[PDB]
Amino acid sequence: SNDVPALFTENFDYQDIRKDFVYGVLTSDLLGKKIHCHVAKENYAARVRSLQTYDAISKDVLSRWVYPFVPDSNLLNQTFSYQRHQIYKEEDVVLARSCIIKARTLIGAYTKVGDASVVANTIIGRNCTIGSNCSIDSAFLWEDVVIGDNCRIGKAILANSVKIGNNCSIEDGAIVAAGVVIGDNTIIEKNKRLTTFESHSQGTLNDPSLVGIGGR
Amino acid sequence: QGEFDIVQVYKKFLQDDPEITMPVAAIEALVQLLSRSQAKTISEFMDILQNGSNTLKEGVQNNISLSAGCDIFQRFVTRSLHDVGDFEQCKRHLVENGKLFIQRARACRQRIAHLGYPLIRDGSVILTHGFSRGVAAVLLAAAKRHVRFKVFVTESRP
Numbered sequence A: 001s002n003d004v005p006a007l008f009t010e011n012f013d014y015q016d017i018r019k020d021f022v023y024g025v026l027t028s029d030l031l032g033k034k035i036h037c038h039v040a041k042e043n044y045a046a047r048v049r050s051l052q053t054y055d056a057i058s059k060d061v062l063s064r065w066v067y068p069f070v071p072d073s074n075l076l077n078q079t080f081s082y083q084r085h086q087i088y089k090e091e092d093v094v095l096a097r098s099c100i101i102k103a104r105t106l107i108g109a110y111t112k113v114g115d116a117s118v119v120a121n122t123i124i125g126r127n128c129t130i131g132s133n134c135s136i137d138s139a140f141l142w143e144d145v146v147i148g149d150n151c152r153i154g155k156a157i158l159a160n161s162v163k164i165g166n167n168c169s170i171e172d173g174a175i176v177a178a179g180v181v182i183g184d185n186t187i188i189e190k191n192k193r194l195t196t197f198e199s200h201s202q203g204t205l206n207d208p209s210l211v212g213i214g215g216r
Numbered sequence B: 001q002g003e004f005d006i007v008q009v010y011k012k013f014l015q016d017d018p019e020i021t022m023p024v025a026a027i028e029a030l031v032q033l034l035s036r037s038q039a040k041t042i043s044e045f046m047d048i049l050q051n052g053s054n055t056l057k058e059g060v061q062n063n064i065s066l067s068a069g070c071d072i073f074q075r076f077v078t079r080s081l082h083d084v085g086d087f088e089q090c091k092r093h094l095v096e097n098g099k100l101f102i103q104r105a106r107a108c109r110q111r112i113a114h115l116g117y118p119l120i121r122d123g124s125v126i127l128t129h130g131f132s133r134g135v136a137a138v139l140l141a142a143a144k145r146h147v148r149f150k151v152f153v154t155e156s157r158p
Helices: A003-009 A017-026 A051-062 B007-016 B022-035 B042-059 B064-077 B088-106 B108-119 B133-144
Strands: A080-083 A087-090 A105-107 A118-120 A135-137 A152-154 B124-128 B149-153
Touching: B007 B022, B007 B042, B022 B042, B022 B064, B022 B088, B042 B064, B042 B088, B064 B088, B088 B108, B108 B133, B124 B133
Parallel strands: A087 A105, A118 A135, A135 A152, B124 B149
Antiparallel strands: A080 A087
């Protein structure tokens, strides 16, 4: 209610909506006010705050728990289409023969998938492209990403415009930023976040980028 | 000479083009038999193509599609036909509308494909019997649109 802002300039110690505000009303630190909960028992509601949620919400979105707000609706003139086992594609996509797609998979448009590759439980941005004889599981791929031939990806986030060479591998928890490139015949261990800038994490773009290092 | 045994013209178009079927050939033959002809009466015109069709019809072992195609061809021409004022309009309206039929005829196998290929779905399995240019076009038009599917084929005795 319109009281809340004026109730926040006053009582300036309040910073967090739950730790400070609620506790104030309940402890009568605020001049005797009331709050209420409207417990929903249908439909869906959550917010993206944690990596352990982005993964969760995504599966909770592909699984149509938030209809109509679903790829198949294409609110921004996308060209998605629901297919059985909760797999989502887009127009003008190319899927090779012998390339197989398992459930809970989403494919953006303008994206290539090489031969004998296996994708599963994975979200893929548009304009991507995958190598051949690869294996991807429970991953996350964004726009303009390439993948070398014969590589293994799993449970990792790959940001926009990322290049991965052949023979590479990458395991769970891995997180990259944009522009980063990994040279052929390379692995990236669990949770080993990285970047393309000079900041805190251990990232640099050039190939290879782990044991063989750029920037350091 | 004049108009030789139009079965030759018929047979020629089969060799001038093998990718066109038997019906569309005779229609391409009659229009010639209509073109290279001066009848001066509507009677002679239709008296010819009847003998023209029956000859073709008696030529091939009374093939259905052919005997079908020809009979349809006649009734299209003689439908909107009328004699008004001059006469050359007759032969004009014949060959002109006769030419139109063929144009509409040869392009039929294309229309079918444009309507048929959505029946073929990704990963589907199709079954056909014998050879048939119609089935060919749609199936090819599927692959040229890049869809994955497998088909069976019947030995098709005899």
